[PDB]
Design a protein around this ligand. Structure first.
Ligand code: IMH
Ligand code: IMH
Ligand code: IMH
Lengths: 284, 284, 284
């Protein structure tokens, strides 16, 4: 609606980093949060706190909005967001997604994003992993689109498509890796719907999200993919099911964050490895 | 997104009231509007205008945003909002719902909210009363959640559930009272969807709200339940059907406010009594 | 939510115009954009740039937000917006729709609005034209309604209906004209859904818009009809299908603006004539 950043601010944040860093990454990864441990498997790791990076979304205690790590993961030059920004935190989307536009100026050209999510598809099960074939951008329908505002042509068009958001190549490239390391549960595949804003859904709210044809649901991610494609990045992403969204009045259970962080933690290596391998089927 | 109130402002509003008032309420009721007359049945009633209560949502002519009454209803200590704030008035939700957070600081621990609403369910009929089993929080999906912003931990969690918003006990406790005073029309039971913002729905808009599985529709309420549960309040609520939402091109009729205020007025005692009795099956 | 304009600003913009203009229009037309050429067929045309009209939505380079033309089209006094304001441009709705409230103060009393749109209905085909029977105002459900804010009673009610937005008379008045000039493709008729904000829909997003029962989809229009009826204007409008919204993973095609402007251009006279004739079945 405004967008408080000019092209310059982006550039200036880039160049700064691009000069406290030997590194020049090609892929950006975004967790998770409980893909946290990933940071380990990197090597030659250089860390930064968001709080010291020019223009980053500042949170209240920094943070709470955490760290940017640069390094090598499976002999690929990475950079990853260990902790991210959300709309429910009160951040507008050109903030949430800000990081995303710096990455591209860094010359990263693939983005992988991950996240936890509730499962809407009855078939799914806590533990599973759903690749993201497509999304419903509900905040988007109503005005909340990280693209809203005057478009800067240096980044992209006024009117990008999202029909093809989630790289095809990568997605198979990908189920390979899944059995090509032999797993009991299959890879899932489906649609992430976004809703904002922090309260968990009602039962009726679930029924509606199932009707729309959604398979999983977070409050995340959605935004920063949309603006990845606005400027080229190939995009590949996926989701940890983490709870079966309560689907009927009767059940006495209740989503909590709690169970989410746990499951996230339980799932852990799974995962860390998965991404880690996948690195290898990203081009050059 | 911000939230202009700090914890202090809430507290200060409480304590003020908590000291021009003998009273110490346990239940908060919210009308209606045309449950207005309720104020009568209270006894030992002490009134206040929003306009003199520190921090209240100020409207333009005060008001237009009206009065807070404290008293006893059926030998329960109450406090009630005679007139409320809406999003379509231009108020953000941490304003609409502000009152709600003061109540809890007052030590109220049950909230009952009522409202008029259009009927989406063909079965329903003008006059009926729909208990609220659940809700679709449509403004919510897109970012408009009274909880959005940085969470204050003194009130509640970052990530409350709403699966169980509408107290089970109370809801039966409740159909009892309905025949246990013998009424021709049955109690209805169903889902309130919220949309904002003041224009009435189109026909196509109705068809969609019916598809989502909604039974009734207002522009209200939704918010302040969500933030009631964010901090404990037991929540019980319901709705006066007030018009059958025009469901097909052809009909020459048109929702108006008008018919709504009327029906509201027609329905009157019905009602006033109902709540009045219900008081008695709230704990202590 | 605020609305930065007072009644005065509207009036002042009117009177200004109402006095660099001989003219006194009765109908307002809004394109399109690629109904641009229409301006030709007017006669006795007086032009203005938005940029010089007191209070108009200013864009960045003026503009980019273009010109207001007054004249006679088929022996009717018109005034038309050659280029309009959108929400995705970052404009709030009491800006987008501002023009609309001036028109009425000008004493215009019919409004016709046109627009391009993607087709959701499989039956439709690029080239077709869909009259607007009704709309889904999705931004609206969540708070984005040009009416939101404190209502000024001089313009309209607090709670207008939209059940009957799209004049019945006019709509047939209308299919007449269509064969009454003998066309191969039939007139289409259906519902325009609005979403905001500039990115094109995903596939999953389409499936949902089809489910809701929408036939076409733009990011436009919706707003300014709603506020037309808030103050009397008879409203009649329609849509150029312009692309078949990609309805399945597989297809390698992608909406672009591009194809849209083209089709718009291809369609051209079609059209220019159509409106041109239609003028004649507007009253006096
Ligand atoms: O059942 C759900 N509904 C909505 N969001 C989530 C989420 C995501 N939302 C956040 C907590 O609600 C958490 O960070 C997670 O990534 C997990 N489960 C659900
Ligand atoms: O048919 C409807 N659609 C949307 N809202 C309402 C309402 C509620 N909305 C307000 C007026 O629209 C009124 O205060 C009422 O509580 C009644 N009927 C309808
Ligand atoms: O497939 C679509 N989806 C959403 N909007 C449009 C539109 C409208 N949106 C604008 C460009 O997206 C264009 O001005 C047009 O009037 C055309 N096609 C589509």
């Amino acid at each position: 609606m405004e967008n408080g950043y000019t092209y310059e601010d982006y550039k200036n944040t880039a160049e700064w980093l691009l000069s406290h860093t030997k590194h020049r990454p090609q892929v950006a990864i975004i967790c998770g949060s409980g893909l946290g441990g990933l940071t380990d498997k990197l090597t030659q790791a250089q860390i930064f706190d968001y709080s010291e990076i020019p223009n980053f979304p500042r949170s209240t205690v920094p943070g709470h909005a955490g760290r940017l790590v640069f390094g090598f993961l499976n002999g690929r030059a990475c950079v990853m967001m260990q902790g991210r920004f959300h709309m429910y935190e009160g951040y507008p989307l050109w903030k949430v997604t800000f990081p995303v536009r710096v990455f591209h100026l860094l010359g990263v050209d693939t983005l992988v994003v991950t996240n936890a999510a509730g499962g809407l598809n009855p078939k799914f099960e806590v533990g599973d992993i759903m690749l993201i074939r497509d999304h419903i951008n509900l905040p988007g329908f109503s005005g909340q689109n990280p693209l809203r505002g005057p478009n800067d042509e240096r980044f992209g068009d006024r009117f990008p498509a999202m029909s093809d958001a989630y790289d095809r190549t990568m997605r198979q490239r990908a189920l390979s890796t899944w059995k090509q390391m032999g797993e009991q549960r299959e890879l899932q595949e489906g649609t992430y719907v976004m809703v904002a804003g922090p309260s968990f859904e009602t039962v009726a709210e679930c029924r509606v999200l199932q009707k729309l044809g959604a398979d999983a649901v977070g409050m995340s991610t959605v935004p920063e993919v949309i603006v990845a494609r606005h400027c080229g990045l190939r995009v590949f992403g996926f989701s940890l099911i983490t709870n079966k969204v309560i689907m009927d009045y009767e059940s006495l259970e209740k989503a909590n964050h709690e169970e989410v962080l746990a499951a996230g933690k339980q799932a852990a290596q799974k995962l860390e490895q998965f991404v880690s391998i996948l690195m290898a089927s990203i081009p050059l």
